[PDB]
Nucleic acid binder design. Structure first.
Ligand SMILES: [Ca+2]
Ligand SMILES: [Ca+2]
Length: 460
RNA sequence: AAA
């Protein structure tokens, strides 16, 4: 069992516990291919190694080997024919691949190659290469393989920065990881911009990287500094680096600014290059949603004639793009939620119900998203289905998720409004009395709460 | 990637 024990010491995709879920594999493969073609980075060894690992997980070991060979071929130029320690990731994946294929002599050859380099570099381990380049590669792999891996990704880059605080690559990976983790908490009460200073530093250390500039722009916009952020959007759009990714995030920036036509123009160009992107399809749907809202405002909710035909175009186009996003990534929870909400606007309550039911069964990485699922389903039940029983059930389920948030507060307020309504139709409804006490209790009005709980108990 |  020497071979397997040695393989487990290698630092490569097979030992990084990426935990790629089958339902997310088609989208991951599409995003890996997109990144190969359109992300401008100094080294591309990592992304080709991840494609090889994906092919392996798909049962295509011969195709996986082709991607490992391409990773080696490309490095001959990304370093000018010179030796680079990132090759050890490729060699580790070769050893594992050959082990799985039964080519065990070749597997041992690649173990020996890794060991030889670990010796040459005075590495303490025989097969586990300790160097910042591989810490970065581990981090980038984690950062590509879904939100559940982002704390681990951030820690990879942080490990490098604790010894080399001006390292450009780990500064970038740390900042992007931190930005996405900030995004998970963006609706929680008292959330803070932990990623802003990291993004400033990453832009300083990677002055040509448009990808990072547009994230800095968006975080500045989050923090009420839209004008400063827009300067970074313009700088990123003036350069060709990773242009198609720059378009995605610039479009988000302009949509949130209110320039929805400009956002759509950018997204339509980006979709020509990466038509499978679920982020693009979701962003396009959000643009059509925003334009739907604009039409409702200008017509005070009663569009007619051409305005109605435009509204219907917006609704049906948003549905098309949200459906496209969830076909490609069925675990994309918030796209299902936008989709359910847009079927309400189309008047199709059965399809809205259908998507809400799917959502109630999901297990989002971001647990607070279930607050929004219950809240919007509760509103659907109250207003479209005219079911106070089910509205109360789901407002309460949102409230039971204790994390303080915008939506938890809205769920408390919606429950309060519903109950106050029922009590006007029936002042001695026991259930509504105690629920109103519950609401006051959550608000901190303990005297008003107890009098309503007591009042309810007397009737009983 | 909604918020
Ligand atoms: Ca390019
Ligand atoms: Ca190729």
């Amino acid at each position: 069992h020497q071979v397997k024990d040695s393989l487990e010491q290698l630092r490569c995709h097979f030992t990084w516990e990426l935990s790629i879920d089958d339902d997310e594999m088609p989208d991951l493969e599409n995003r890996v291919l997109d990144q190969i073609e359109f992300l401008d980075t100094k080294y591309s060894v990592g992304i080709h190694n991840l494609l090889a690992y994906v092919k392996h997980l798909k049962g295509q070991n011969e195709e996986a080997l082709k991607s490992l060979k391409e990773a080696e071929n490309l490095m001959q130029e990304e370093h000018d024919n010179q030796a680079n320690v990132r090759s050890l990731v490729t060699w580790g994946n070769f050893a594992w691949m050959y082990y799985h294929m039964g080519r065990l002599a070749e597997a041992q050859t690649y173990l020996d190659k890794v060991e030889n380099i670990c010796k040459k570099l005075s590495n303490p381990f025989r097969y586990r290469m300790e160097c910042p380049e591989i810490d970065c590669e581990e981090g980038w792999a984690l950062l590509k393989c879904g939100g559940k891996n982002y704390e681990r990704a951030k820690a990879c880059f942080e490990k490098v920065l604790e010894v080399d605080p001006e390292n450009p690559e780990s500064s970038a990976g740390y900042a992007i990881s931190a930005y996405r983790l900030d995004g998970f908490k963006l609706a929680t009460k008292n959330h803070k911009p932990f990623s802003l200073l990291p993004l400033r530093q990453a832009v300083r250390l990677n002055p040509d990287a448009g990808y990072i500039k547009v994230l800095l722009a968006l975080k500045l916009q989050d923090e009420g500094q839209e004008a400063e952020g827009e300067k970074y959007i313009e700088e990123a759009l003036a350069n060709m680096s990773s242009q198609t990714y720059v378009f995605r995030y610039a479009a988000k920036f302009y949509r949130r600014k209110g320039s929805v036509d400009k956002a759509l123009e950018l997204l339509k160009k980006a979709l020509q290059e990466t038509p499978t992107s679920v982020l693009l399809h979701h962003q396009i749907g959000l643009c059509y949603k925003a334009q739907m809202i604009q039409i409702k405002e200008a017509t005070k909710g009663q569009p007619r004639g051409q305005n109605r035909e435009k509204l219907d175009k917006m609704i049906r186009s948003a549905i098309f793009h949200f459906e496209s996003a969830v076909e490609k990534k069925p675990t994309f929870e918030v796209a299902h939620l936008d989709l359910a909400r847009m079927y309400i606007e189309a008047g199709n309550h059965r399809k809205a119900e259908e998507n809400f039911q799917k959502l109630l069964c999901m297990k989002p990485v971001v647990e607070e998203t279930m607050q929004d699922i219950h809240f919007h389903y509760g509103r659907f039940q109250e207003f479209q289905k005219k079911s106070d029983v089910n509205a109360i059930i789901h407002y309460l389920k949102a409230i039971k998720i204790e994390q303080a948030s915008l939506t938890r507060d809205k769920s408390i307020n919606s429950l309060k409004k519903l109950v106050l309504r029922k009590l006007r139709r029936k002042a001695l409804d026991l259930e509504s009395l105690s629920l109103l006490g519950f609401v006051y209790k959550l608000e901190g009005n303990m005297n008003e709460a107890e009098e309503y709980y007591e009042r309810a108990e007397r009737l009983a």
